Amino acid sequence: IGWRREGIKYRRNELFLDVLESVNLLMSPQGQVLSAHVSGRVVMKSYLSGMPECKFGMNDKKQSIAIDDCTFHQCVRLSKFDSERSISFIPPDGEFELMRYRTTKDIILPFRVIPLVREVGRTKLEVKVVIKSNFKPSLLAQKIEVRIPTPLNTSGVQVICMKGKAKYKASENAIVWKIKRMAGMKESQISAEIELLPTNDKKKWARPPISMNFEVPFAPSGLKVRYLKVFEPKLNYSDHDVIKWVRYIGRSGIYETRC
């Protein structure tokens, strides 16, 4: 074995699994998903004694998700995944990437963006954006940013938002609304008045999408870890001696809602 030395010993045999997912969305102005996909990787950080034979189990096809394709670390026995979908491997010590994967089916979209505009003649836009969190209420999203583009003839912006903070950034022609925490199954809204400069009648504005950034503590693909079994047949620790941890870190990629 080339990726693992033979004499490894730990008093505290511990492992950490990171399920790291980027969820991507393009949503139409009428609420139809135009395109959506998840890119994921599973990083393992193991401190295990000797040369353990590990088995990784997830909810691949109550909730069972569909993996469009994936690639593994060279340590994974591919032929075991080819006739039984069993991810078996002797892990390298420390941190390594166990697999990369891509999902498109039955994606959890953590946030819904509902915009609303009201052209007050040629002087101003009166606009309201509502975000809805669509996940278990016991979970918090963090680092939420809602990004609302403004026309290039904007002379000034007023905003009201009961939650978070919002600044107009004329350098970037966007209102940036930042929210530190939001729990699942909640609504928050921002109102903005956008005062306009005179502008060329013919030259119109193709309203760019409202876009979002967020971090959620679940896998938007729906992936759940079911087990990571550790079997070291020569040494006197067994599976239940191993201290095992999982965390899910789902982040936004392209997350754009068309107006």
């Binding site: 503590p217 087990y227 990571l228 095992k244 941890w245 999982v246 965390r247």
Partner: peptide, 6 residues
């Protein structure tokens, strides 16, 4: 965050 695994 990290969760104890079953």
């Amino acid at each position: 965050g990290y969760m104890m695994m079953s």
